[PDB]
Structures are given as C-alpha cells and as structure tokens.
Amino acid sequence: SAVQQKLAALEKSSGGRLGVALIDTADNTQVLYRGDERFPMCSTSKVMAAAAVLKQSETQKQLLNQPVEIKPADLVNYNPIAEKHVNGTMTLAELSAAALQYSDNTAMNKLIAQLGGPGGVTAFARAIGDETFRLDRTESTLNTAIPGDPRDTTTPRAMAQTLRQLTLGHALGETQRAQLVTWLKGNTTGAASIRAGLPTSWTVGDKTGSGDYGTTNDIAVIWPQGRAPLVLVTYFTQPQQNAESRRDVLASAARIIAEG
C-alpha cells in the first residue's frame, strides 16, 4: 500500500525496527506494519495493569479509593509521584493516575501487587481475549528490552485491539472505561510522540513507553472531529543497548497514518 511504503521508508531512515497498528473503527479496517512482531512494551504495559484493577473495582466498588502505603523500599528506578508520598499513602486511583499520566514505576508495582503479581496482569489480558500480551517482570526490570527476549512483549496488532476493547469497547464497565479514557487523555508524557504527528484539533489519550535499546513506544486512542475514533499503536526499538530515545519516529509514523 502507500502507507506501508512510507512507513518502511521511515523505518529505514531511522536505523531501528518500527511496528505500527491502526484500527479505523469506521469500517474496522486495519493498517499494520510489523503488526505480528513482538516488541518490548515497556511502560505501555501500565494500561493493562490499570485496566485490570479497574475490572476488579467492578466487584469491589470502593477499590479505587483504598489507601496503599508507599514505603522507602517500594522505590525503584523512576518514581516522580510516589516519591512525594513515602511514609504516607496513595489510593489505587492516585496510583493508577500516577502510573498512566506520569509513567511512575512504583505506582505500576503497586498495581501489579494488587493483582497478585505480573501473572495477574497477563491473566486480565487473556480474560479479554488478548492471547499475545505477556507481563513477566515488575518495574523496573521489565524495560531491559533485550533483542529477541519474549518477556514483557506484545505485538502491535494485539495491543491495538486490546486498547480498542478497553477504551471504546466494553471490556470494562462504563464507569471504569470512562475513568481509563479520562486518565489517558490527561497523560503528561506524550507531547512529542503520537500527539506530535496528529492534527491539533484531534483529541488524544495515550500511554508512552521507554526502555533500553532506545525503545520508544506510544499507544493511543484518537478522537477526530466528525468521524469515528481510531486506535493507533506505534512501537520502536533499536540495535544499540545505549541508543537514544526516538519519539520523533512515533510522531512521524502517526503523521503518515493520519495522511492515509
């Protein structure tokens, strides 16, 4: 196709490996580039964990309001929100917001613990029909993004369908899905990623991810004005373990998709 030519050229210019999945819910058509290759998720896995806790809150009605202790030993690699509350508490709502909107790794670990470990996040994925997602480690070792390692990976195809089911479909209850959509729309980390390649008049909710091997990810639900929303997944990873972040590739991939 024309979009796949331009994505392949973008990838070639970049020196890395690019994966894209678009779902146009208007006609349920799909655009895929390396749509079935595994990519390390990095922080994009935070969406699955927060959604799993939201699914729990469908039965435990006050769950999101339950306080969770933040202790000094809880801290790991990147904790911008949780480090403010050490020797205090945060609710599962404030932890879900921290994980999603600031990519707080300590908050992700509290969500994983609430679910019974990483297997509890993978379980929720299988429960909503995602056979591909796998969460194997906690923060921050899940970001090693080692070439060929299947741990903590998914494919663009699988994550686009899951993100659609979570935020536009009914994998969650309506209250829960509205809260996930709100959280995603308030992300603070995505300005240079998918959002940067899309028309300013479109509303976006997204979760970025970053890791070793210059892994630079973004998964987004996109609300253009007038037409049905879209779901866009852009994953990117690089040959060098110390490679720099390349959020510009995700922006350019979104731009190419939006023009097609």
Short mmCIF file of C-alpha atoms in Angstrom, two decimals:
data_model
loop_
_atom_site.label_atom_id
_atom_site.label_comp_id
_atom_site.label_asym_id
_atom_site.label_seq_id
_atom_site.Cartn_x
_atom_site.Cartn_y
_atom_site.Cartn_z
CA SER A 1 0.00 0.00 0.00
CA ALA A 2 1.02 3.66 0.02
CA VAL A 3 1.13 3.98 3.82
CA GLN A 4 3.28 0.87 4.12
CA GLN A 5 5.80 2.27 1.62
CA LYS A 6 6.17 5.42 3.72
CA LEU A 7 6.36 3.52 7.00
CA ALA A 8 9.06 1.25 5.57
CA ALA A 9 11.00 4.32 4.42
CA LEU A 10 10.59 5.96 7.83
CA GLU A 11 11.89 2.76 9.43
CA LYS A 12 14.82 2.59 7.02
CA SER A 13 15.74 6.22 7.74
CA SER A 14 15.64 5.55 11.48
CA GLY A 15 18.12 2.66 11.80
CA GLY A 16 15.67 0.80 14.05
CA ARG A 17 12.68 -1.54 13.94
CA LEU A 18 9.21 0.00 13.74
CA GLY A 19 5.85 -1.59 14.49
CA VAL A 20 2.50 0.06 13.75
CA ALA A 21 -1.12 -0.99 14.10
CA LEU A 22 -4.03 1.29 13.21
CA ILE A 23 -7.69 0.39 13.68
CA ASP A 24 -10.16 2.59 11.81
CA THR A 25 -13.35 1.73 13.64
CA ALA A 26 -15.41 3.40 10.91
CA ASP A 27 -15.06 0.34 8.67
CA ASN A 28 -12.98 -1.76 11.09
CA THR A 29 -10.15 -1.58 8.57
CA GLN A 30 -6.60 -2.06 9.79
CA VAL A 31 -3.21 -0.68 8.84
CA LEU A 32 -0.33 -2.86 10.07
CA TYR A 33 3.45 -2.63 9.79
CA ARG A 34 5.29 -5.50 11.52
CA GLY A 35 1.89 -5.97 13.15
CA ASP A 36 2.67 -9.50 14.40
CA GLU A 37 6.26 -8.99 15.55
CA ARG A 38 6.88 -8.86 19.29
CA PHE A 39 8.11 -5.58 20.78
CA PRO A 40 9.10 -4.82 24.31
CA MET A 41 6.16 -2.99 25.84
CA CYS A 42 7.96 -1.04 28.46
CA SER A 43 5.58 1.41 30.18
CA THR A 44 2.76 0.74 27.70
CA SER A 45 2.01 -2.32 29.85
CA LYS A 46 0.79 0.11 32.54
CA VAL A 47 -2.53 0.40 30.63
CA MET A 48 -3.20 -3.32 31.04
CA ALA A 49 -2.41 -3.21 34.76
CA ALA A 50 -4.56 -0.15 35.49
CA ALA A 51 -7.40 -1.67 33.47
CA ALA A 52 -7.11 -4.92 35.42
CA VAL A 53 -7.53 -3.03 38.69
CA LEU A 54 -10.47 -1.18 37.14
CA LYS A 55 -12.03 -4.54 36.25
CA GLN A 56 -11.58 -5.55 39.91
CA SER A 57 -13.36 -2.36 41.03
CA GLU A 58 -16.44 -3.56 39.12
CA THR A 59 -16.96 -6.02 42.01
CA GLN A 60 -15.10 -4.13 44.76
CA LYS A 61 -16.97 -0.86 44.34
CA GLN A 62 -14.75 1.23 46.65
CA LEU A 63 -11.48 -0.36 45.43
CA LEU A 64 -10.14 2.75 43.68
CA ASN A 65 -10.46 4.61 46.99
CA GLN A 66 -8.45 2.09 49.04
CA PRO A 67 -5.28 3.61 50.53
CA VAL A 68 -1.95 1.92 49.77
CA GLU A 69 1.21 2.54 51.78
CA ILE A 70 4.24 3.95 49.98
CA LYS A 71 7.36 2.81 51.81
CA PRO A 72 11.03 3.69 51.17
CA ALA A 73 11.75 0.14 49.99
CA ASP A 74 8.98 0.46 47.39
CA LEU A 75 11.02 2.86 45.27
CA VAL A 76 12.66 1.72 42.11
CA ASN A 77 14.15 3.40 39.03
CA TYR A 78 11.69 6.24 38.20
CA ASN A 79 9.16 7.37 40.79
CA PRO A 80 8.04 11.03 40.17
CA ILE A 81 4.70 10.86 42.01
CA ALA A 82 5.23 8.10 44.58
CA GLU A 83 8.46 9.63 45.91
CA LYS A 84 6.28 12.53 47.12
CA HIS A 85 4.25 10.26 49.40
CA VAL A 86 6.83 7.98 51.02
CA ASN A 87 5.82 7.09 54.59
CA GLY A 88 2.28 8.08 53.63
CA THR A 89 -0.39 6.54 51.44
CA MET A 90 -1.87 6.88 47.98
CA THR A 91 -5.17 5.44 46.83
CA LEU A 92 -5.34 2.96 43.96
CA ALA A 93 -6.92 5.79 41.93
CA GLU A 94 -3.97 8.11 42.59
CA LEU A 95 -1.61 5.21 41.87
CA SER A 96 -3.38 4.43 38.59
CA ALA A 97 -3.23 8.10 37.63
CA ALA A 98 0.46 8.26 38.56
CA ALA A 99 1.28 5.14 36.54
CA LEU A 100 -0.67 6.27 33.49
CA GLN A 101 -0.09 10.03 33.39
CA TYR A 102 3.50 10.26 34.72
CA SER A 103 4.74 6.71 34.00
CA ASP A 104 5.54 6.21 37.70
CA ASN A 105 7.22 2.82 38.12
CA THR A 106 6.47 2.49 41.84
CA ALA A 107 2.78 3.05 41.09
CA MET A 108 2.87 0.30 38.45
CA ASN A 109 4.37 -2.06 41.01
CA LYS A 110 1.53 -1.32 43.45
CA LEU A 111 -0.97 -2.12 40.70
CA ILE A 112 0.86 -5.38 39.96
CA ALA A 113 0.83 -6.27 43.67
CA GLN A 114 -2.91 -5.54 43.90
CA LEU A 115 -3.38 -8.04 41.06
CA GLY A 116 -1.27 -10.77 42.68
CA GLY A 117 1.90 -10.36 40.62
CA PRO A 118 2.64 -10.00 36.90
CA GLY A 119 0.66 -13.15 36.18
CA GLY A 120 -2.41 -11.28 37.38
CA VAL A 121 -1.91 -8.66 34.66
CA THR A 122 -1.37 -11.29 31.95
CA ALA A 123 -4.47 -13.07 33.24
CA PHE A 124 -6.62 -10.00 32.66
CA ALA A 125 -5.27 -9.79 29.10
CA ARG A 126 -6.25 -13.40 28.41
CA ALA A 127 -9.64 -12.76 30.03
CA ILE A 128 -10.44 -10.07 27.45
CA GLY A 129 -9.17 -12.16 24.53
CA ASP A 130 -5.57 -10.95 24.27
CA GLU A 131 -3.52 -14.12 23.74
CA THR A 132 -0.34 -12.21 22.92
CA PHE A 133 0.36 -9.80 25.79
CA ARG A 134 2.71 -11.18 28.41
CA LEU A 135 3.89 -9.41 31.55
CA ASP A 136 6.70 -11.35 33.21
CA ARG A 137 8.57 -8.88 35.41
CA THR A 138 7.87 -5.94 37.70
CA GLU A 139 9.40 -2.47 37.42
CA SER A 140 11.95 -1.70 36.51
CA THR A 141 13.47 -4.88 35.06
CA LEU A 142 10.61 -5.16 32.56
CA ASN A 143 12.35 -2.43 30.47
CA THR A 144 15.51 -4.33 29.53
CA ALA A 145 14.02 -4.61 26.01
CA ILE A 146 16.63 -7.16 25.04
CA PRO A 147 16.55 -8.06 21.33
CA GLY A 148 14.61 -11.31 20.88
CA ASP A 149 13.58 -11.72 24.53
CA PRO A 150 9.85 -12.64 24.67
CA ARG A 151 9.41 -11.41 28.27
CA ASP A 152 7.23 -8.31 28.68
CA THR A 153 6.31 -8.08 24.98
CA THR A 154 3.26 -7.84 22.78
CA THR A 155 2.60 -7.20 19.11
CA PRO A 156 1.18 -4.05 17.53
CA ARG A 157 -1.89 -5.96 16.29
CA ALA A 158 -2.71 -7.37 19.73
CA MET A 159 -2.23 -4.13 21.67
CA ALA A 160 -4.30 -2.05 19.26
CA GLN A 161 -7.25 -4.46 19.57
CA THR A 162 -6.90 -4.57 23.35
CA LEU A 163 -6.68 -0.80 23.68
CA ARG A 164 -9.79 -0.57 21.50
CA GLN A 165 -11.70 -3.06 23.66
CA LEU A 166 -10.66 -1.24 26.84
CA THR A 167 -11.44 2.36 25.87
CA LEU A 168 -14.04 2.12 23.08
CA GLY A 169 -15.45 -1.39 23.52
CA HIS A 170 -16.91 -2.86 26.67
CA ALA A 171 -14.08 -4.93 28.14
CA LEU A 172 -14.69 -2.72 31.20
CA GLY A 173 -17.80 -1.34 32.85
CA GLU A 174 -18.88 2.08 31.64
CA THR A 175 -17.73 3.91 34.76
CA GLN A 176 -14.39 2.08 34.54
CA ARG A 177 -13.88 2.72 30.83
CA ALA A 178 -14.72 6.41 31.25
CA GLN A 179 -12.11 6.65 34.00
CA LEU A 180 -9.49 4.95 31.84
CA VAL A 181 -10.32 7.31 28.95
CA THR A 182 -10.02 10.29 31.31
CA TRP A 183 -6.68 9.07 32.64
CA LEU A 184 -5.31 8.56 29.13
CA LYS A 185 -6.47 11.97 27.92
CA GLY A 186 -4.58 13.53 30.83
CA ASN A 187 -1.24 11.88 30.12
CA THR A 188 1.64 14.33 30.54
CA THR A 189 4.42 12.33 28.83
CA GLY A 190 3.23 12.15 25.27
CA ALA A 191 3.63 15.54 23.72
CA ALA A 192 6.49 14.53 21.44
CA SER A 193 5.15 11.13 20.42
CA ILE A 194 1.95 10.26 18.65
CA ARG A 195 0.31 13.60 19.58
CA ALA A 196 3.03 15.48 17.69
CA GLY A 197 2.14 13.90 14.33
CA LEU A 198 -1.62 14.42 14.51
CA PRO A 199 -3.82 17.44 13.72
CA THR A 200 -4.19 19.67 16.77
CA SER A 201 -8.00 19.51 16.50
CA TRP A 202 -7.97 15.77 17.36
CA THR A 203 -8.40 14.68 20.97
CA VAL A 204 -5.91 12.01 22.06
CA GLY A 205 -5.41 9.72 25.03
CA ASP A 206 -2.15 7.82 25.11
CA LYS A 207 0.40 5.86 27.14
CA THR A 208 4.08 6.15 26.22
CA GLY A 209 6.82 3.66 26.92
CA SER A 210 10.59 3.96 27.06
CA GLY A 211 13.35 1.44 27.69
CA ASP A 212 16.80 0.16 26.88
CA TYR A 213 17.81 -0.37 23.24
CA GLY A 214 16.31 3.09 22.66
CA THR A 215 12.87 1.56 22.90
CA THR A 216 10.32 4.32 22.30
CA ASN A 217 6.62 3.40 22.33
CA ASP A 218 3.20 5.01 22.31
CA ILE A 219 -0.31 3.61 22.25
CA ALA A 220 -3.18 5.97 21.63
CA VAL A 221 -6.91 6.28 21.18
CA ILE A 222 -7.69 9.18 18.85
CA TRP A 223 -10.92 11.20 18.53
CA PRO A 224 -11.01 13.29 15.35
CA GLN A 225 -13.90 15.69 14.94
CA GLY A 226 -16.76 14.36 12.86
CA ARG A 227 -15.58 10.80 12.24
CA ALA A 228 -15.30 7.56 14.19
CA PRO A 229 -12.30 7.32 16.54
CA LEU A 230 -9.16 5.36 15.74
CA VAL A 231 -6.72 3.31 17.78
CA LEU A 232 -3.03 3.67 16.96
CA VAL A 233 -0.09 1.68 18.32
CA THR A 234 3.50 2.69 17.48
CA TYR A 235 6.43 0.64 18.82
CA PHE A 236 10.08 1.27 18.02
CA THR A 237 13.33 -0.30 19.18
CA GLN A 238 16.95 -0.07 18.14
CA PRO A 239 20.10 -2.21 17.74
CA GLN A 240 22.28 -0.47 20.36
CA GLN A 241 21.65 -1.08 24.07
CA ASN A 242 22.51 2.56 24.86
CA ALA A 243 20.55 4.09 21.96
CA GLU A 244 18.77 7.40 22.49
CA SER A 245 15.01 7.81 22.63
CA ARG A 246 13.40 8.45 19.22
CA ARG A 247 9.96 9.90 19.97
CA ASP A 248 10.17 11.68 16.58
CA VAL A 249 9.77 8.32 14.82
CA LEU A 250 6.44 7.78 16.59
CA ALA A 251 5.31 11.29 15.65
CA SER A 252 6.28 10.72 12.02
CA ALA A 253 4.55 7.33 11.96
CA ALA A 254 1.35 8.93 13.25
CA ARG A 255 1.66 11.72 10.68
CA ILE A 256 1.99 9.14 7.88
CA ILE A 257 -1.02 7.22 9.20
CA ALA A 258 -3.11 10.37 9.58
CA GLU A 259 -2.41 11.25 5.91
CA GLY A 260 -3.81 7.92 4.76
#
